[model samples]
Target chain A: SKNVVIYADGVYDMLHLGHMKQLEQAKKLFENTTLIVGVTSDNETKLFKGQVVQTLEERTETLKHIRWVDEIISPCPWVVTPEFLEKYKIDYVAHDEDIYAWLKRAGKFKATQRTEGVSTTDLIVRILKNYEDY
Target chain B: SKNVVIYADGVYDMLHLGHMKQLEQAKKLFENTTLIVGVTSDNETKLFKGQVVQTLEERTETLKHIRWVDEIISPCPWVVTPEFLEKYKIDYVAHDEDIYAWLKRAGKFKATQRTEGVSTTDLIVRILKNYEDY
Candidate 1:
């Protein structure tokens, strides 16, 4: 029997401190864990995020670099639903409050429970607001 | 003093009935208006949505086709914030329920609420559930 270490999954493009921290923390807890990252393909992500420069192949390649990550799974639909969790057998999921709470009570929910955290969206906001003249 | 008719801006990537209706309704509200659609750059939307094959130029070109839209504005960051409102001088903004509600009480959050229903996310999910064999 193999303990499949579960992690919150998404495109997670534009890797930042928040992303790095999450990955590092998740890896630290689960040794030799088969990290299942649910990546949203370029087509699906494009609908919400807008014009994406990097292709799905590029995102896939980038995830391969994560030492702890053992495998990558790109879901056809972008959002995580009940069916998704059941299908993936994703038990221990890692996500911030927004995402965690968003999925709260949806299904059997579990997470890595890391405290020191930031989201890529928030990071983008901080930089743009603090640095940009306009 | 030039009246810059600012339209609610985003990728507006996936074109569907919800989009078509919104565009038509928006045009009706602002006749002969210069619809300044603030499109998110390729690099920005990618961070949130996932991998994107469509380049900025491609997305821009798509917006150009909408007969109602007179012009387009590509912003640096993906998320729209107060700084964006001030810099763009976006007089009038239009958004959907989630977007409008999210931006509400955030300083000059003008929005055009749609009457008809259907979201791209929902559409995607429907297809995914119905056609998971692939």
Candidate 2:
């Protein structure tokens, strides 16, 4: 049988330990997994999630170095549709929580926990709090 | 003996896995360790090292989060001296190479290896190369 493909999604701006740990869980959530990471596009992220530190390619470059990721799709849909998963051959969606009702309803959700006390927000604030330093 | 204190210093901009690994070695180089991390100031780093992504306080905050770090000093001097060592009670300096002759001459140099193929410059170039996307 072919490896089950688990799909993970994120903006992954300012890539930190938390981002790494999130991917770790996605890749290890099941055996014989092909972890495909969907990085939502820069504009889409900015439109919905506010400003991001890393652009699409830069963000992708950060994810490319992660060992857990088998494949990456940049400019992927943030609001995933059933059609998107089918087209991508995604078997499951892994995340800190079930944000995708379509995936959850379809039994395609595999929950993972985010690294507590570590986040891109916290990192950015550190730089902003000492604005003159960075 | 104070568990053979190991001093690790750096600009530590854009805090990546490579930076973390470098500090890891310094912390693990000796037993019963006290890892002292010296983060050079933003302006001094900018003057000497070209450009930096973090300020002293921002850099210090990053070091504070590391599980292995015991104490952190920012606005630190990049050029070490015998007087500096005595004042801080530094037993050894750990890095990928021997940059401080005073530390080496004092039999206080402990060499560690950097994570291959990872650096702040490389990260910056990746963003610059794909500037439009970023």
Candidate 3:
């Protein structure tokens, strides 16, 4: 008799509108939702990802502040990892199509990607370059 | 009339109490202070840092939200660049000793490092590992 129906994972480093939109959409589909934010760490990020700004605590606090989320899981090494996902009885897993494809290919949980909108990373690049002077 | 300052930067990812304290100290010392936050792109972060859960926009937005910040600069290709320092007529540079020493040796601005307290990056890693077993 648990309403804990679904869960999603992401680095949530910057916690942008795209993430919000994704979570918002996810919230609409389910009532009891838990969000697992995976912040791999600075060294890990440097080794694997790009130049992210927010620290783990910062990301965790941001996720804590979000209204849609019920429980927050941290230290997520990466999305679509069985290490964390296996812990959840996650009725459904949601993500963008590209992410969805990756997860599906891994043959993990049931995954679906919502279609729409630009990502936070894209926005970051756009904003950074917008003020280029002549 | 002008208090042009060369701002040192960091991941500033989590933006915790230490960050605020440091910035507040900086603002106190200088009048016309400009905080140019250097957010490396997420693509670069994953490759170098780890799994940056948050997207680029999220990180930028987080930086934008901090009240202490006056201006936001972006896409720092890497560390402190001579090209960046040359653009401003910097009167003084302020930071905790570790960073200060480097900049000072580089012959940029007068440097000073703040001592004491925890960093957000360390805090993030701690939080993740703290809850790992749970």
- Can you give the TM-score per candidate against the true fold? 0.37, 0.51, 0.39
Kindly list the per-residue Cα lDDT of model 3 for residues B17-125, writing each as its tens digit: 5655565566556566665555677777778776554456656666664545666666655555556666654445555656356566776554445534455445445
* Chain A TM-scores in order: 0.63, 0.85, 0.63
Task: In model 3, state the lDDT of residue A111.
Answer: 39
Q: Report the poorest 10 consecutive residues by lDDT, candidate 1 chain B.
A: B115-124
True contacts kept of 1: 0.00
Best by lDDT: 2
Alpha-carbon shift of residue A64 in model 2 (angstroms): 0.8
Question: Where in model 1 is the C-alpha error above 4 Å?
Answer: A1-4, A29-32, A97-103, A110-134, B1-134
lDDT of 3: 0.57
lDDT of 1 by residue, B1-134 (tens): 45546566666544333554565555555445556676777767777776443457655654554545666786546666667767766656666546555456554455455634344344334434645676
**How would you order the candidates by TM-score, starting with the best?**
2, 3, 1
Chain B TM-score, one value per candidate, order as shown: 0.61, 0.82, 0.63
**Which candidate, 2 or 3, has the higher lDDT?**
2
lDDT at B86, model 3 = 68
| DockQ value of candidate 3 | 0.03
Which pairs clash in model 2?
A: A133-B55, A134-B55
